[PDB]
A paper describes a structure:
[name] is a major gram-negative pathogen responsible for a variety of infections and possessing an array of both intrinsic and acquired resistance mechanisms, including β-lactamases, like the chromosomal Pseudomonas-derived cephalosporinase ([name]). β-Lactams are the most widely prescribed class of antibiotics in the United States, and antipseudomonal cephalosporins (including cefepime) are important therapies (alone or combined with β-lactamase inhibitors) for [name] infections. Taniborbactam (formerly VNRX-5133) is a novel, investigational, bicyclic boronate β-lactamase inhibitor shown to inhibit members of all four Ambler classes of β-lactamase enzymes. [name]-88 was chosen as a representative member of the group for detailed characterization and is noted for a T289-P290 deletion (by structural alignment-based numbering of class C β-lactamases, “SANC”) in the R2-loop (ΔT289-P290). Herein, we focus our efforts on [name]-88 to better understand both the basis of this expanded-spectrum activity and its inhibition by taniborbactam.
The active sites of the [name]-3 and [name]-88 structures in complex with taniborbactam revealed strong electron density for the bicyclic boronic acid inhibitor. Taniborbactam was covalently bonded to the hydroxyl group of the [name] catalytic serine (S64 by SANC) and made extensive interactions in both the [name]-3 and [name]-88 active sites. The boronic hydroxyl moiety of taniborbactam in both complexes made hydrogen bonds with the backbone nitrogen atoms in the oxyanion hole involving residues S64 and S318, as well as with the backbone oxygen of S318. The carboxyl moiety of taniborbactam interacted with T316 and S318; the amide moiety of taniborbactam made hydrogen bonds across the width of the active site (with the backbone oxygen of S318 and with the side chains of N152). The hydrophobic bicyclic rings of taniborbactam made hydrophobic interactions in the active sites with L119, Y150, and L293. For [name]-3, residues Y150 and Q120 adopted two conformations in the apo structures and only one conformation when taniborbactam was bound. We superimposed and compared the taniborbactam-bound structures of the Class A CTX-M-15 (10), Class C E. coli [name], and Class D OXA-10 (34) with [name]-3. The major difference in taniborbactam conformation between [name]-3 and the other three structures is found in the 2-aminoethylamino-cyclohexyl moiety. In [name]-3, this moiety extends away from the bicyclic scaffold moiety, whereas in CTX-M-15, [name], and OXA-10, this moiety points in a different direction, allowing it to make van der Waals interaction with the hydrophobic atoms of the bicyclic scaffold of taniborbactam.
Numbering used by the authors: 3 to 361
Write the structure that this text describes.
Amino acid sequence: APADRLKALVDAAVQPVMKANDIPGLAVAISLKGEPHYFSYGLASKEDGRRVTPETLFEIGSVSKTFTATLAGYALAQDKMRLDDRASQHWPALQGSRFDGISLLDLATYTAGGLPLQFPDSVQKDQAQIRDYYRQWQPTYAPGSQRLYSNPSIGLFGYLAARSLGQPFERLMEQQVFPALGLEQTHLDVPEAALAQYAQGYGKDDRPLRVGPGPLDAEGYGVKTSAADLLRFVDANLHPERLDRPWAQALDATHRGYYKVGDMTQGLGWEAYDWPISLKRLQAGNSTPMALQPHRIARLPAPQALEGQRLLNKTGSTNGFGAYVAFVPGRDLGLVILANRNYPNAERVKIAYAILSGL
Ligand SMILES: *[B@@]1([O])OC2=C(C([O])=O)[C]=[C][C]=C2[C][C]1[N]C(=O)[C][C]1[C][C][C]([N][C][C][N])[C][C]1
């Protein structure tokens, strides 16, 4: 009955949203009282009819920023950097730029002063173009005043964290972070031997879409992982104390809120809400205006522990994929929803809400 109840609950949440958004395949993973549960739907590739499993690789887009924050947490834990460090202390090519006046915290939390959603199309994945972009950049407003969701912002934060550790970002992620987290199905660059597991993404007219190279892609949106591995990451977030001490500290650094915008408390990577809260309020916190418009922040007097009766979440999108992760620390509850369509965030939250309410 409990298997049937749980399959009934997840089916009732997922199936209508998959039909309504024409999602070819979707993988759900739930952590409930320290037990994993997997629900797999539809097709990883329509063309060959490969089915979604808990080992299928999906692009998770901006959920990658929670990994980036974890590498920064590790640099913090090892005293290689501090959140109030000036950005240019960690990259000489930025010295003399406006990044002399911008903290790592500002970049991490999108408050550096109007760094845009994306690098402009003119900036390719090239070290010199990225250096020249940041050197010439000027804030639109005061650092620390307005949140504007930004790849270049948290991207630079992860790149500087990696420089502080004396190694490239992508090497640190593959050689240190993923192994420390027990993640063997999590990739920035999918190995040839694992390509059979990589789902096809679908956009308008079902055009096939896997993410192409871009400046600080790894930092902003580069992760491919399975529902099984992303739920392991969620379980590490729910129990940092089970990891070796420096990684425990790295994960705790991602559970600290610095400011509020509406119902949302901004941490490093993770965005937090009180729990319970209405579905409409959780959808609004993950809405298009929150991604695309600047918002004045309400700074907290001291960083707040993101634990207890709160929901921590992150949405992630690429042109072909739509991911959502959410966990409730105080209820030992975790959830991963990976899909091979970029379907609206409101719809991803609709599935999660139905599941989390059901439990
Ligand atoms: B990220 O996934 O977060 C994000 C959301 C969200 O939170 O779900 C909504 C809207 C935008 C973003 C930004 C992030 N994702 C990307 O930046 C998408 C990425 C950008 C580069 C593209 N490549 C261009 C081709 N040369 C691929 C999509």
